[PDB]
Design a protein around this motif. Structure first.
Motif, mmCIF file in Angstrom:
data_model
loop_
_atom_site.group_PDB
_atom_site.id
_atom_site.type_symbol
_atom_site.label_atom_id
_atom_site.label_comp_id
_atom_site.label_asym_id
_atom_site.label_seq_id
_atom_site.Cartn_x
_atom_site.Cartn_y
_atom_site.Cartn_z
ATOM 1 N N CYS A 26 0.856 -1.182 0.000
ATOM 2 C CA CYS A 26 0.000 0.000 0.000
ATOM 3 C C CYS A 26 0.891 1.230 0.000
ATOM 4 O O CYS A 26 1.745 1.377 0.879
ATOM 5 N N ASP A 27 0.698 2.098 -0.989
ATOM 6 C CA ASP A 27 1.518 3.286 -1.170
ATOM 7 C C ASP A 27 0.659 4.543 -1.179
ATOM 8 O O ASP A 27 0.895 5.477 -1.949
ATOM 9 N N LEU A 36 -4.186 3.356 7.705
ATOM 10 C CA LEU A 36 -3.805 2.269 8.599
ATOM 11 C C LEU A 36 -5.018 1.483 9.081
ATOM 12 O O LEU A 36 -4.925 0.269 9.289
ATOM 13 N N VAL A 45 -5.844 -0.701 6.099
ATOM 14 C CA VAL A 45 -4.844 -1.757 5.992
ATOM 15 C C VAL A 45 -5.102 -2.859 7.016
ATOM 16 O O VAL A 45 -4.855 -4.043 6.754
ATOM 17 N N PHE A 59 4.580 -7.502 3.977
ATOM 18 C CA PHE A 59 3.835 -6.282 3.701
ATOM 19 C C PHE A 59 4.771 -5.084 3.634
ATOM 20 O O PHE A 59 5.863 -5.082 4.209
ATOM 21 N N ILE A 110 3.841 -0.904 3.710
ATOM 22 C CA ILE A 110 2.750 0.052 3.872
ATOM 23 C C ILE A 110 3.360 1.431 4.076
ATOM 24 O O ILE A 110 4.110 1.648 5.038
ATOM 25 N N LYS A 111 3.056 2.354 3.167
ATOM 26 C CA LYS A 111 3.477 3.736 3.345
ATOM 27 C C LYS A 111 2.828 4.319 4.590
ATOM 28 O O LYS A 111 1.614 4.213 4.781
ATOM 29 N N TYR A 137 8.237 3.668 5.490
ATOM 30 C CA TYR A 137 7.546 2.477 5.024
ATOM 31 C C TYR A 137 7.548 1.431 6.125
ATOM 32 O O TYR A 137 8.605 1.065 6.651
#
Ligand SMILES: Nc1ncnc2c1ncn2[C@@H]1O[C@H](C[C@@H](N)CC[C@H](N)C(=O)O)[C@@H](O)[C@H]1O
Ligand SMILES: [Cl-]
Length: 260
Positions: free
Chosen positions: A141-142, A161, A164, A175, A177-178, A216
């Motif tokens: 996820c970006d 978040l 996510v 994973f 995640i940004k 990240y």
């Protein structure tokens, strides 16, 4: 009280146009995109070019062991698809599913024929905040839009978040995640809770510009959240002082071509 990152953000908001332009790239790592940008403008699809700067960022994490993608990859907020195309070249990846909103002002999936393009599906018109979560092996996820307000950045990061979380409950093994805003006290507390539940840690990718504090959240990292965040804030503040430092270049991503 005020965190180091909050100090960084306030000072960033005090910069003139010239100060901001010079600070933005001072001492950062970067890929030169001129060759890729021309090809993709010409509509070429077979030169091995990445569709975006995002490919180099995920490559940085993958090449240093912070993330080992495998199996079914989901790429939330895939935009043009730089992360999805990079994932498709990884031996253990079996499938890549990208989802992005698209529309005016937003990036549309790009269709190119870099190595492994045939195991990819990029879907536009998808608001991931209203998509049902599904199982996957690698969750990417970006998402997160920069703002001059740290208040806005915090709220956008928390929304990401929470979205996510539902995917992480499907228990992927990897994973990335940004986390747009990790630098407020609430956000550090939020990521300590998430780290306790799901593991991983926060990593600053040096291709990130100095005008964002993005980090990240990656499954292969273990670092203490507060230390990693405060280290990044210190780095960014120190670059606001003294003379401009040169950009350090890596070679741009060559993803090859052909099918898998
Ligand atoms: N709620 C949302 N749902 C789907 N996509 C979104 C949403 N919010 C932002 N986005 C998109 O997520 C993408 C974030 C990009 N920076 C990602 C770049 C991508 N990793 C690449 O390598 O090309 C943008 O294209 C956004 O338009
Ligand atoms: Cl975004």
């Amino acid at each position: 009280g005020e965190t180091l990152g909050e100090k960084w953000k306030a000072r960033l908001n005090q910069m003139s146009a010239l100060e901001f332009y010079s600070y933005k790239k001072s001492g950062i790592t970067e890929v030169c995109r001129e060759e890729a940008r021309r090809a993709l403008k010409d509509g070429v699809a077979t030169g091995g070019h990445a569709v975006s700067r995002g490919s180099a960022k995920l490559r940085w994490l993958v090449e240093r062991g912070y993330l080992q993608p495998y199996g079914k990859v989901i790429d939330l907020g895939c935009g043009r698809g730089g992360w999805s195309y990079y994932a498709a070249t990884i031996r253990k990846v079996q499938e890549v599913k990208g989802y992005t909103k698209g529309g005016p002002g937003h990036e549309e999936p790009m269709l190119v024929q870099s190595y492994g393009w045939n195991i990819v599906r990029l879907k536009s018109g998808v608001d991931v905040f209203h998509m049902a979560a599904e199982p996957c092996d690698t969750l990417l996820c970006d998402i997160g839009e920069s703002s001059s307000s740290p208040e806005v950045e915090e709220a956008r990061t928390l929304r990401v978040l929470s979205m996510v979380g539902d995917w992480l409950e499907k228990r992927p093994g990897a994973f990335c995640i940004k986390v747009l805003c990790p630098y407020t006290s609430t956000m550090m507390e939020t990521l300590e809770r998430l780290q306790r539940r799901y593991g991983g840690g926060l990593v600053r990718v040096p291709l990130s510009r100095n005008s964002t504090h993005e980090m990240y959240w990656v499954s292969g990292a273990k670092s203490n959240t507060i230390k990693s965040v405060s280290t990044t804030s210190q780095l960014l503040l120190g670059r606001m002082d003294g003379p401009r430092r040169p950009v350090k270049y890596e070679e741009d991503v060559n993803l090859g071509s052909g099918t898998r």
